[PDB]
Amino acid sequence: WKKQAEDIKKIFEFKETLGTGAFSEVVLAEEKATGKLFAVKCIPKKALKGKESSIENEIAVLRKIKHENIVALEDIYESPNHLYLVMQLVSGGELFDRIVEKGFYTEKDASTLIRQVLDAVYYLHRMGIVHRDLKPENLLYYSQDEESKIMISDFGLGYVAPEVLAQKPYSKAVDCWSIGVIAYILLCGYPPFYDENDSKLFEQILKAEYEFDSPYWDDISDSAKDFIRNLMEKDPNKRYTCEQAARHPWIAGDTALNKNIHESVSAQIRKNFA
Ligand SMILES: CC(C)(C#N)c1cc(Nc2nc(N3CCC[C@H](N)C3)ncc2C(N)=O)cc(C(C)(C)C#N)c1
């Protein structure tokens, strides 16, 4: 299943870095043989020492599975000192850019986005993967047009749950908290927790102290607010799972409103982010 290369440069031309992690880099790559573009995750094998077999066994499982809302793992190359995970290039645009660029945006649009993220994350959880880094930056559109699906663009083999901040044991439920935070930002354009003081911010997240403040939340449905409260729940035992959230009427039913909330959401995205 793993392709072997003496030098990955025999296969790919590397262009700009898309993301930099701890001993992982995602780079735009062109396959020299075809001209096709990919996002290639470059990993030094020395960084995997003691878990190489385990990580490869997991990649071997995921290479065979495509989820509509997750970057496909297209190929794996092994060089003498690196692994290269050849991923689908998700080229349709960034999440916040799209919302700002739209002239018209409703709760139904936000619900549609969250439904896709719930589907993707439910699947990762079934496979034993806790994403741990769900945030707008990891969500990209497949295509530039208005019907494009959203995709989780990257995953590991302010948005962090209170139990993680409390250095307590944590589970897949941390992802459900993060999805609630994303839903919050999608309906008002600003984060639910922020303070210039990190200590105050830490305490607000630990206590799950947030509000649906006026005027930004006045024309948002009770159903949306209930949906968010069930995910942004301090107690991971009480917190909705992805499965429970997918059954809530705001996702599965017809309670998401049809009001154009673009003006306020786009103004707040512009004002609250760089
Ligand atoms: C080259 C371009 C214009 C296209 N086509 C483009 C493609 C992507 N694509 C990906 N970006 C990432 N990362 C960046 C986001 C956070 C994540 N942790 C790592 N990882 C995987 C993919 C993928 N699967 O395509 C990203 C950007 C930029 C950098 C502008 C953004 N955002 C630009």
Swiss-Prot record:
Induction: Expression increases upon treatment of EC cells with DMSO and retinoic acid. Induced by KCL in PC12 cells.
UniProt-recorded Gene Ontology molecular function terms: ATP binding; calcium/calmodulin-dependent protein kinase activity; calmodulin binding; protein serine kinase activity
Residue span(s) of domain Protein kinase: 12-251
Binding site for ATP: 18-26, 41
Ways its activity is controlled: Activated by Ca(2+)/calmodulin. Unlike CaMK4, may be unable to exhibit autonomous activity after Ca(2+)/calmodulin activation.
Keywords, ordered alphabetically: Allosteric enzyme, ATP-binding, Calcium, Calmodulin-binding, Cytoplasm, Inflammatory response, Isopeptide bond, Kinase, Neurogenesis, Nucleotide-binding, Nucleus, Phosphoprotein, Serine/threonine-protein kinase, Transferase, Ubl conjugation
Active site per the UniProt annotation: 133 (proton acceptor)
GO cellular component, one term: cytoplasm
Domain notes from UniProt: The autoinhibitory domain overlaps with the calmodulin binding region and interacts in the inactive folded state with the catalytic domain as a pseudosubstrate.
Assigned protein family: Belongs to the protein kinase superfamily. CAMK Ser/Thr protein kinase family. CaMK subfamily.
Protein name (Swiss-Prot/TrEMBL): Calcium/calmodulin-dependent protein kinase type 1D
Complete-protein stretch covered: 12 to 302 of 385
